[PDB]
Design a protein around this ligand. Structure first.
Ligand code: CDL
Ligand code: CDL
Ligand code: PLX
Ligand code: PLX
Ligand code: PLX
Ligand code: PEE
Ligand code: PEE
Ligand code: ADP
Lengths: 107, 459, 320, 347, 40, 98, 54, 121
């Protein structure tokens, strides 16, 4: 058996590098300390300061385009009218029966 | 809608002309800005929709998914920064290009007024994910996973295409608006039964359904962290969005045809929750938990009531965020220990306390603790199911119990107990990882303040 | 107008350039013999072009700048290690032999291209033919395995079946003991460690397998140590004999056009030196391959095509 | 051979095809096929070796048999109607003989056996010419007489061709046999839409020719005829492997690539005729083609295979010959899906 | 620590005359590197 | 349709079948092709002469010419194949396999 | 986990498909390159086409 | 729609004279912009394959690719529009000349049509 027991010429598997060794205060972004610090700063400013706060405030104050207040005011005036006029509040038929032509069965 | 699509396209030239050491910073900044821009589609109407043009329209079902899709890209970049550090500049730029292409395809998929355009983009998303899994995955099984993830999908998607073109030959249009307004009942016929199956199975395989869920643990365990994040957060929700869109033309045949899928989902959620109890792999456990949650979403869509649809929307958003966070936590452990086995690295609360707090919050939100939006969706679906049949409460309660059990089991196994003695390479958690967890979790607890934003068009 | 079918169609024919002086010659001999001096004298006297023997960095001399590259980026082998530890565990011996054969093939293609393009003859040391003799010795001394020689034979067949052999084969016959005396008088510490068995195997596989095989398709001039000193008689012998037994008299314009398209395109010359047959001595892992290729690309004038490298000093890039 | 002779032979092949496509007389169409056959053989036998001679002999035998059957059909049709113009067949027996002859010329199943044999025997340039240019004439003749063809027989042969291509490509490690089986499957896709729309046949032919040209030129550039030989290409020219992978994705019909355009349209067309089952089987069978394309993509660019030491020498040299139309072919075979309605140009 | 890449035993799966070797096709030999056979 | 035409067509079918068995002798394959063209010539000539279609008296000649040219090419190919093996046996062409 | 997810759900859809396609490929591609058999098959399909579609 | 035999069709004419009655595509047509983009991608791939600086190797070559793609795309768009115009013209003429095959259906409102109601329960 003259074989070297080696299937091929391969690089050895390297050991994983620690970012805290060559740079304490490493922030875990990049091995260049300046790029690391500025990547931290941009992530924090555009993620927490801009999107997370201003976007939440923007969503909180979105105008009532779903028409909830409008619907409640319409219902309030409608109830006020129907209570006064003795009408039976909501009706069972959603559409006026006089504008529906039913088919005669005559069976 | 182009005010979102064009900046996403401009992300590519900006990425490729960036400096060798400026790709991550620029990509993250501009992705966050695009998310902020997309956040203004949440202003929806109680009327029809936001019909921008003949090609793209917005809905209160589409808008939360679009916002989540935009928000996911910066987090994916932050998560991918670490394990791609020793990589060449060209290949890092190619990875970022794959991520940007996937975002663009998803954004166009979710608006997509046409069913054929929706199908084309829905299948276009399949390519970048496949490349990401089979190229930047660590294990030898990634290739196999990719094969599964591909063919399963196409096995369901080719019949759909046929059905789609068939429909346009009879209806004359595949526009969602005309399809909805001109819908006519579907007769109880063999031809209509097979048309129903062709329309459903494509979205059913992607949820995934309990019977057809085998590709998912493979794909998630084999994919890199960003691939897992996008698979669990957005790609699983394409099936739910498609089913909600397409079930409008399948009535009243859904009443009869839904029974096998309802039984498969209600039993397979119990099955996968119990599977999570005996799992030696974190990623596999999180994948099976995702299968259970999507089984509940399938039940919601098949029941097809207003409360079902609201709960399905809420649960899809909540699960996307929670599962992405869980995968990120498991990946932070893996990048230290290189094992991905749950029993190996133990007692990490003593060594990494803030990350233990993140683990606790993620487990609590996966457990559906009120008033989280996870429980809002869960409870709405459960109430709709109870109205559908009062006996479903048994299976729902069992699922809740088993879910609490495996969530706290995963927390206790990894964080509590005694540290493993021979593991001495556990470094303090980085600012990048803590910020990643915070950017996952704060949006959930903010969304619980305004739930109507994620309750869909039937709110 | 780079040579191609259009040039052949318009005017370019290589038969008119031949003036009975082309007559490619290849000199041989043992490891430590005066074959190089005799070859240089032949080249000077006949007015031909001399090709110094191909080494580890012969390809480096014809590409980019002529400066040799690093050993890890060019060859990944060394003769000094072969001398020091001929039975090395990393397979340096057969890696060296295969890289040297590829260099010989490249140099033979270059010589054929020069002869077919200019008509001037060339003189060479050890060619792709008689390169195997070292291989044979390495097999008998136990330095390489039988799979190594089988892979060498496959590559040699599929590569050397495409070229015209030299008209004249010149051999300098020097016995082993006087070669060894020359070796010790040389002074090279690594050269000192050659055994007499290795040189004997080289010579024996040399005059017991290479002389008759070239006798049937080439014209061989055997010379001893004393009678190789005088190049005048060698030149006279070369001029007197006429070659009419090999493949050369049967060549014509279209065969020459085929061969001239062959000898250009060094990538298509070197095509079969990397056939996917996996010997541990020569196969390289994916990770090391990626790292070494990336290191090679980062060389000063190697990222782009020769005229498109700004760092070396190429200008007007945006208009080329 | 002499470059002038090679140019003359190529122009004779092209003139035979053009004579087939411009003539209205059956005898002139037969003469064009004969001229094309006659000038095709030396092109296949350009690189002289026993494999190429065997391939040329097989090709000549099959094509001469097809020509004899074509003349037989012409004579029967003349017997039952004194007509020489290419239009109607005028006889059920003459139409069957004609369809068989044209299927043998195209390589449709069950007459597919010669395609892998000849493609493996000949070089890459000869295979490029064989699999691209040699389909124009039989398909043009088929497009002219499509209203005569029995849809049952044509659809049977098309489905057989798709099935055979899919199953036969799964077992291949040689790239030329993979190309041959891909060609067989694409011929099956083309001929399944002739009874309904010849415009879709022509569109499929154009897309297939573009993809095949790009694929063959990439294979010639990275001069590999074997899967393992192609596995070494990344260590010299990774961009070529990336372009090859995207081209293979396009060839598999994956959207949003160009190769999705024909099948989609074809399926679409076949649904207008209340044909549902056959397009479904066609797509499910094309999944096999996609599978072996994915296997090649795994072997080529998505993973990095072991290399050899001598490859370093190849790092120092550049291609002497470059292909002018390769970038255009790659872009056209990859990114023309947005331009689909341009098919109304009746290409 | 290192992404897996194919080794020799993985690459040798794709070096046969055909995929999926069988008893009948076991004796089949891959074609010569140059498409030329010995004239015998 | 007379019986003579059917006899000629059946001769054509027999020649085609003979070309299809391939017992051996690619030489016999060329013979079968030549028998096929002979039947084609005969039947085309009969049809054209019967109907007094004066101009198509051209095409049998043409057909003849072209077919013979083909035969020449085929013969050449045969020789080269034999030049490799020393015989024209059909089973010798087994180097390339599907 | 083992009986259903790792075995039977795997056996039914993906494993059966792989086995069927593998056998079909091995059957179809395995031709010894003998044109005798090819042209015999050609004659059989010619007669079947004549006797089946008219 | 096989228009190959449509009467009064000049055999090898790319654009007939009557096609001049149609509005030409605008130079800023999105399809023309996409054809120019395809030419740009071809230039980039040409630079990449030849191992040249991809973005800034040959500006004349990339300009020529873009220009040729735009030229052919303009003429192709014209022919496409003309063919669709012919299809619509023929369809409308056929409907006009065959009134018995395309009848005017009676106008019915939903208040007088009975559709079956299927409760969701
Ligand atoms: C109750 C009201 C309180 C009001 C005060 C305001 C509080 C604001 C909190 C905002 C959300 C928390 C952010 C998550 C990240 C955690 C922060 C962190 O990094 O800690 C480092 C920081 C520094 O300490 P350290 O020593 O450096 O770190 C060492 C280790 O970290 C070790 O640290 P540790 O050992 O100290 O543990 C960390 C701590 C923090 O970690 C957590 O687990 C916090 C997250 C808990 C929620 C879990 C998900 C379930 C979904 C519920 C959704 C609620 C959100 C409501 C809206 C939120 C708006 C964004 O975990 C706990 O203490 C366990 C608490 C379990 C809570 C279960 C009860 C849930 C329902 C309560 C009612 C809510 C609605 C009421 C409606 C009816 C009445 C009006 O420590 C803290 O600040 C602790 C946070 C305070 C505890 C939170 C518990 C109550 C808050 C609930 C949410 C807001 C309620 C609004 C109603 C007001 C009326
Ligand atoms: C949805 C539609 C919208 C999006 C459109 C997307 C498509 C558009 C582009 C299409 C293709 C054109 C370019 C491709 C040529 C490739 C060149 C290259 O290699 O990159 C190097 C090159 C720089 O590197 P270098 O130093 O020159 O030389 C390095 C060597 O090239 C080689 O470097 P190396 O040797 O050091 O590294 C080797 C590497 C080299 O290999 C490669 O680079 C692969 C090249 C991509 C393949 C192209 C296929 C054909 C098109 C397919 C499109 C598919 C889309 C459909 C969805 C499916 C997704 C796959 O290969 C590998 O590492 C093997 C492993 C790769 C993993 C698996 C392969 C996946 C590739 C899929 C990529 C798909 C998107 C590519 C985007 C462009 C990438 C540059 O990158 C560039 O700079 C070119 C990017 C474009 C420049 C944009 C300039 C415009 C900016 C200013 C104007 C602003 C615009 C707005 C105006 C108004 C503002 C005021
Ligand atoms: C360390 C301990 C904390 C220290 C600090 C102490 C103080 C704690 C107090 C904060 C928590 C206590 C809860 C009290 C809530 C007060 C704010 C609340 O009332 O506002 C809500 C408003 O909150 C927002 O609606 C919800 C937040 C928006 C969420 C968007 C996420 C950010 C975008 C980032 C992308 C994420 C992608 C997710 C996919 C969907 C509801 O407002 P609403 O009653 O209605 O009407 C607003 C006023 N109107 C009437 C004029 C309209
Ligand atoms: C594997 C992992 C999960 C994958 C997804 C699984 C979900 C797919 C299940 C398909 C849904 C049911 C299919 C058809 C439902 C219709 C009801 C019918 O089947 O039942 C009776 C039908 O009777 C019999 O069932 C006839 C069909 C029997 C043949 C089917 C094979 C039975 C088992 C095969 C299961 C294999 C499924 C997977 C195939 C690959 C009803 O009696 P009848 O009143 O008369 O018919 C009314 C319907 N009409 C009016 C249209 C005619
Ligand atoms: C596959 C991608 C496209 C590649 C196409 C090649 C590109 C280079 C071609 C350069 C221009 C060629 C045009 C030739 C000039 C005049 C042609 C004219 O004389 O002929 C007309 C014919 O014009 C051509 O047929 C139209 C060619 C246009 C082809 C492009 C359509 C491809 C489909 C859309 C995919 C996107 C491709 C766009 C990017 C290139 C009239 O033909 P006619 O005698 O009356 O009928 C015979 C043909 N029939 C029987 C089918 C009806
Ligand atoms: C493969 C062959 C599939 C056979 C199914 C036949 C179904 C069919 O033909 O229905 C056609 C029907 C209309 O009937 P007509 O023929 O047009 O007219 C009838 C009234 N005169 O049209 C359609 O709906 C076509 C829809 C595609 C059919 C479905 C084909 C595949 C089976 C259904 C999908 C379920 C499998 C999905 C696999 C999931 C794996 C993850
Ligand atoms: C009508 C015909 C329909 C054909 C449908 C084809 C579906 C696509 C799958 C094709 C796979 C067939 C080939 C195959 O599997 O080969 C065995 C192959 C061996 O691997 P090789 O790399 O080729 O080499 C091994 C020796 N070194 O086995 C595998 O690796 C398979 C791994 C991935 C499995 C993919 C599973 C796909 C099927 C999922 C269900 C849907 C199938 C499609 C139809 C569903 C019916 C509605
Ligand atoms: N094919 C080969 N294998 C191993 N070593 C070789 C080979 N070719 C040349 N060499 C080495 O190159 C060196 C110089 O060659 P040599 O002819 O012996 O000296 P000189 O240049 O004086 O003629 C020698 O040490 C020789 O061994």
């Amino acid at each position: 058996p003259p074989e070297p027991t080696i299937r091929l010429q391969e690089d050895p598997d390297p050991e994983d590098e620690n970012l805290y060794e060559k740079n304490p205060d490493s922030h875990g972004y990049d091995k260049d300390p300046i790029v690391d610090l500025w990547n931290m700063r941009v992530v924090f400013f555009f993620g927490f300061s801009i999107v997370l706060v201003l976007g939440s405030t923007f969503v909180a104050y979105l105008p009532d385009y779903r028409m909830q207040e409008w619907a409640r005011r319409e219902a309030e005036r409608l109830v006020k009218y129907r209570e006064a006029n003795g009408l039976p509040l909501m009706e069972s038929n959603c559409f006026d029966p006089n504008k529906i032509q039913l088919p005669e069965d005559e069976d | 809608m182009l005010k979102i699509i064009i900046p996403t396209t401009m992300l590519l030239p900006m990425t490729w002309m960036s400096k060798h050491n400026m790709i991550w910073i620029n990509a993250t900044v501009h992705s966050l800005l695009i998310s902020l821009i997309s956040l203004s589609l949440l202003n929806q109407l109680g009327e029809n929709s936001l019909n921008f043009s003949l090609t793209f329209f917005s809905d209160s079902l589409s808008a939360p998914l679009l916002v989540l899709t935009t928000w996911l890209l910066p987090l994916m970049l932050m998560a991918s920064q670490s394990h791609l550090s020793k990589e060449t500049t060209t290949r890092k730029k190619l990875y970022i290009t794959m991520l940007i292409l996937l975002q663009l395809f998803l954004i166009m998929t979710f608006t997509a007024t046409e069913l054929i355009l929706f199908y084309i983009l829905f299948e276009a998303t399949l390519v970048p994910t496949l490349i990401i899994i089979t190229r930047w995955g660590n294990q030898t099984e990634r290739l196999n996973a990719g094969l599964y993830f591909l063919f399963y999908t196409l096995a369901g998607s080719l019949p759909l295409l046929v059905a789609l073109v068939y429909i346009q030959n009879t209806t004359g249009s595949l526009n969602f608006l005309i399809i909805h307004y001109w819908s006519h009942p579907l007769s109880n016929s063999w031809s209509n039964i097979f048309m129903w199956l062709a329309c459903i199975m494509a979205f059913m395989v992607k949820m995934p359904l309990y019977g057809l869920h085998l590709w998912l643990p493979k794909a998630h365990v084999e994919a890199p962290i960003a691939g897992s994040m996008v698979l669990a957060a957005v790609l699983l929700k394409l099936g739910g969005y498609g089913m909600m869109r397409i079930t409008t033309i399948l009535n009243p045949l859904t009443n009869y045809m839904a029974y096998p899928f309802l039984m498969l989902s209600m039993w397979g959620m119990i099955m996968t929750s119990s599977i999570c109890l005996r799992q030696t792999d974190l990623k596999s456990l999180i994948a099976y938990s995702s299968v259970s949650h999507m089984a509940l979403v399938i039940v919601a869509i098949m029941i097809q009531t207003p409360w079902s649809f609201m709960g399905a929307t809420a649960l899809m958003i909540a699960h996307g965020l929670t599962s992405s966070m869980l995968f990120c936590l498991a990946n932070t452990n893996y990048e230290r220990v290189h094992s991905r086995t749950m029993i190996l690295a133990r007692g990490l609360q003593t060594l990494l306390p803030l990350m233990a707090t993140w683990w606790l919050v993620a487990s609590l939100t996966n457990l559906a603790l009120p008033p989280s939006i996870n429980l809002i969706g869960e409870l709405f679906i459960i109430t709709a199911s109870f109205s559908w049949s009062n006996i479903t409460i048994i299976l729902m309660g069992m699922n809740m119990m088993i879910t609490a059990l495996y969530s706290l089991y995963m927390l206790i196994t990894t964080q509590r107990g005694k540290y493993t003695h021979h593991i001495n390479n556990i470094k303090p958690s980085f600012t990048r990882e803590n910020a990643l967890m915070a950017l996952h979790i704060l949006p959930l607890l903010l969304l619980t303040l305004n739930p109507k934003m994620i309750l869909g068009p039937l709110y | 107008l780079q040579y191609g079918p259009l040039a052949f169609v318009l005017g370019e024919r290589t038969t008119r350039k031949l003036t009975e002086t082309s007559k490619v010659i290849t000199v041989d001999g043992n490891i430590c013999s005066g074959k190089g001096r005799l070859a240089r004298e032949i080249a000077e006297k006949l007015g031909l072009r001399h090709f110094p023997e191909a080494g580890i960095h012969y390809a480096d001399s014809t590409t980019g700048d002529g400066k040799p590259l690093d050993v890890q980026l060019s060859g990944n082998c060394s003769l000094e290690k072969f001398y020091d530890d001929p039975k090395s565990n990393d397979g340096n011996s057969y890696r060296l032999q295969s890289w040297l054969y590829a260099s010989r093939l490249l140099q033979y293609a270059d010589a054929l291209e020069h002869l077919l393009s200019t008509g001037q003859g060339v003189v060479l040391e050890r060619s792709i033919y008689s390169d195997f003799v070292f291989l044979e010795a390495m097999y008998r001394q136990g330095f390489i395995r039988k799979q190594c020689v089988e892979h060498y034979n496959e590559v040699k067949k599929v590569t050397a079946c495409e070229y015209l052999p030299p008209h004249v084969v010149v051999y300098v016959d020097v016995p082993v003991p006087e070669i060894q005396s020359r070796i010790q008088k040389k002074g090279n510490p690594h050269e000192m460690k050659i055994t007499a068995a290795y040189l004997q195997d080289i010579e024996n596989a040399y005059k017991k397998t290479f002389l008759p095989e070239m006798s049937e398709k080439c014209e061989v001039l055997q010379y001893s140590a004393r009678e190789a000193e005088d190049a005048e008689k060698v030149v006279e012998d070369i001029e007197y004999l006429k070659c009419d037994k090999g493949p050369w008299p049967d060549q014509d314009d279209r065969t020459f056009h085929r061969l001239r398209m062959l000898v250009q395109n060094k990538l298509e010359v070197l095509n079969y030196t990397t056939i996917p047959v996996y010997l541990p001595e020569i196969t390289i892992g994916a990770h090391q391959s990626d790292r070494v290729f990336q290191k090679f690309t980062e060389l000063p004038g190697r990222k782009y095509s020769p005229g498109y490298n700004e760092d070396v000093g190429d200008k007007w890039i945006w208009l080329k | 051979m002499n470059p002038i002779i090679y140019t003359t032979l190529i122009m004779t092949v092209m003139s035979g095809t053009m004579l087939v496509m411009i003539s209205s007389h059956w005898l002139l169409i037969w003469i064009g096929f004969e001229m094309n056959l006659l000038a095709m053989i030396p092109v296949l036998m350009k690189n002289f070796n026993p494999r190429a001679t065997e391939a040329a002999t097989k090709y000549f035998l099959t094509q001469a048999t097809a020509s004899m059957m074509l003349m037989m059909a012409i004579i029967i049709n003349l017997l039952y109607s004194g007509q020489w113009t290419i239009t109607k067949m005028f006889n059920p027996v003459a139409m069957t003989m004609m369809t068989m002859a044209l299927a043998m010329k195209l390589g449709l199943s069950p007459f597919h056996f010669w395609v892998p044999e000849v493609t493996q025997g000949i070089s890459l340039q000869a295979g490029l010419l064989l699999l691209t240019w040699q389909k124009l004439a039989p398909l043009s003749v088929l497009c002219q007489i499509s209203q005569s063809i029995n849809p049952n027989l044509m659809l049977t042969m098309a489905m057989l061709s798709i099935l055979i291509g899919g199953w036969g490509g799964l077992n291949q490690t040689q790239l030329r046999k993979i190309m041959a089986y891909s060609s067989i499957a694409h011929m099956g896709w083309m001929t399944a839409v002739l009874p309904y729309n010849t415009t879709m046949t022509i569109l499929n032919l154009l897309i297939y020719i573009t993809m095949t040209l790009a694929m063959f030129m990439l294979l010639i550039h990275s001069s590999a005829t074997t899967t393992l030989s192609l596995s070494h290409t990344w260590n010299k020219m990774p961009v070529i492997t990336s372009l090859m992978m995207v081209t293979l994705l396009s060839m598999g019909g994956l959207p949003p690539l160009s190769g999705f355009m024909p099948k989609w349209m074809i399926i679409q067309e076949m649904t207008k005729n209340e044909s549902i089952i056959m397009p479904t089987l066609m797509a499910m069978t094309a999944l096999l083609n996609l599978y072996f394309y994915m296997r090649l993509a795994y072997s080529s660019s998505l993973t990095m295979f072991p290399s050899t030491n001598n490859m370093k020498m190849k790092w120092q040299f550049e291609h002497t010959k470059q292909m002018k139309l390769l970038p255009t072919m790659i872009v056209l075979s990859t990114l023309v899906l947005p331009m689909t309605p341009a098919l109304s140009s009746l290409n | 620590a290192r992404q897996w890449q194919p080794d020799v035993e993985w690459a040798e799966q794709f070096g046969g005359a055909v995929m999926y070797p069988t008893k009948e096709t076991a004796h089949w030999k891959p074609p010569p590197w140059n498409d030329v056979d010995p004239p015998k | 349709m007379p019986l003579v035409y059917m006899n000629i067509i059946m001769a054509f079918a027999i020649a085609l079948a003979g070309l299809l068995m391939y017992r051996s002798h690619l030489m016999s394959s060329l013979l079968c092709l030549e028998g096929m063209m002979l039947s084609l010539f005969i039947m085309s000539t009969l049809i054209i002469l019967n109907t007094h279609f004066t101009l198509a008296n051209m095409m049998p000649i043409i057909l003849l010419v072209f077919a013979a040219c083909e035969a020449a090419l085929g013969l050449s190919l045969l020789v080269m194949v034999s030049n490799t093996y020393g015989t024209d046996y059909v089973q010798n062409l087994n180097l390339l396999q599907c | 986990s083992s009986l259903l997810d790792l075995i039977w759900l795997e056996t039914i859809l993906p494993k059966t498909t792989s086995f069927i396609q593998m056998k079909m490929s091995i059957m179809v591609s395995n031709q010894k390159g003998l044109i005798k058999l090819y042209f015999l098959s050609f004659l059989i399909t010619i007669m079947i086409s004549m006797t089946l579609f008219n | 729609t096989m228009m190959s035999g449509r009467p009064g069709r000049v055999p090898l004419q790319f654009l007939p004279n009557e096609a001049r009655s149609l509005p030409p595509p605008k130079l800023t047509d999105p399809r023309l912009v996409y054809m120019g983009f395809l030419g740009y991608c071809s230039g980039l791939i040409d630079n990449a394959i030849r191992r040249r600086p991809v973005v800034s190797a040959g500006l004349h070559r990339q300009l020529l690719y873009v220009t040729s793609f735009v030229f052919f795309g303009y003429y192709l768009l014209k022919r496409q529009d003309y063919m669709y115009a012919l299809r619509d013209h023929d369809m409308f003429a056929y409907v006009k000349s065959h009134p018995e095959d395309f009848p005017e259906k009676d106008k019915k409102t939903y208040g007088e049509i009975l559709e079956e109601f299927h409760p969701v329960r």
